[model samples]
Target: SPRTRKVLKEVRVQDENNVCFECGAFNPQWVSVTYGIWICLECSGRHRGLGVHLSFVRSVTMWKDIELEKMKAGGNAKFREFLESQEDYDPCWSLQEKYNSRAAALFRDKVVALAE
Candidate 1:
């Protein structure tokens, strides 16, 4: 009941990635098919513990790597190097692609929202 809100306590919160934003950590044991990420039992408790919208946190962290890449490049040379380096790049594990795909998806929503 709303009258008992003060007595209740929150343990943790989880993003769509199944990781705790407050902790920036995940449980290697628990697995999620929708996100393809692992979540700990403690974090899972936080996800449903409160009535807050945790989806926003999930949206933000998804593009963390792209932000880091922008910081590392610093200039046009970084962009040039990225294009040149990837001209023939094909790999079984593409961390760069993973980062870019998440970044694009995150921002694409913003662009579409504005066009509306």
Candidate 2:
């Protein structure tokens, strides 16, 4: 588990400026295995509210081997590509003004719907 966390940290360190996948703010500290993306602490709570089936959240400080493998397959960057392709970039709203807005929930819902 520690090894997995180390790897995740190393990967996250490479793109420290990459904002949260849900909200546009730099330096996210949480990971979502269900979507293969990094998220902010606040958004992680929202994701948790979405239930485990839709968004499985975990701290970057600790993670499982399978979660690490899933991230390795396709993390935030990969999910971003998918978002751009699907024209769903707006879901990544903003941490300041748009945080916890209805748009944020809509965005999360859209992402989960599409992922399914």
Candidate 3:
């Protein structure tokens, strides 16, 4: 539906999802409901390569609202919070490994440990 993209922007998360979560491309067209991050076509392929169970929709109205809300919560900054935001020249392979290998789970656990 045309409104799908409309709500995707209007109800967007505080972290600002209009750009790619992985590589920060402009107005990324693809989304992973698993993580609630808007991503570039290239990054979309990366996410699809990993599959739904790992990263993060639903039917029509189910998706129209629920998927929209999921994106609001799981936008770029939160995903980075889980995976550890970074900068470097490695480019592609490592991000796939990071998500696929679930190495960022360490930070998730690390935060758990931190509260003690």
Candidate 4:
């Protein structure tokens, strides 16, 4: 059943729209697209099996409260810290860049060792 509901990556669109690119549904919970931008959260969680449910819900609640607080506080340094700590882009991007560089170096080293 889940597989049938699975959003096909090939259906993604480059333009920004409220409707889901895969299922063509209106206003989905989350959205993402490979080699593009945005896909629905249901589609994002297609690969997960209840493992991320609790944590994802918890993060959503925490972010809602934290963001409200930040807005009331008129955006302090803590606001920046809170924003950075959430399931957001900064940490993901930084970690991805770090890991990719490390993996590339390791692969290069292994190739050199093998050739020598």
The numbered model that scores best in lDDT is 2
Ranking by lDDT: 2, 3, 4, 1
Clashes of each: 1, 0, 1, 7
The runs of at least 3 residues in candidate 2 whose Cα sits more than 4 Å from the true structure, single-residue gaps closed, are: 13-17, 87-116
- Model 3 worst lDDT run, 10 consecutive residues: 107-116
Q: Which candidate model has the greater lDDT, 3 or 4?
A: 3
Q: Which tens-of-lDDT digit does each residue in 34-110 have in candidate 2?
A: 65678888988887876675567888765455666666554576555554554334654553333334433454554
- Pull out the clashing pairs in model 1: 12-46
Residue-level lDDT for 37 in candidate 1: 30
Which pairs of residues collide in model 2? none
Sequence-dependent TM-score of model 1 = 0.21
Per-candidate TM-score against the hidden true structure: 0.21, 0.65, 0.61, 0.24
The global C-alpha lDDT for each of the candidates, from Candidate 1 onward, is: 0.30, 0.62, 0.59, 0.31
**On a 0 to 100 scale, what is the lDDT of residue 79 in model 4?**
24
Best by TM-score: 2
Tens digits of per-residue lDDT for model 3, 1-116: 67775666564545757778778888777777756667777877777677565554232233445556565556567667655454432235466566654444443334334323
For model 1, residues 26-80, the per-residue Cα lDDT tens digits are 4332322112233455544543343222211121212333322222222122222
Ranking by TM-score: 2, 3, 4, 1
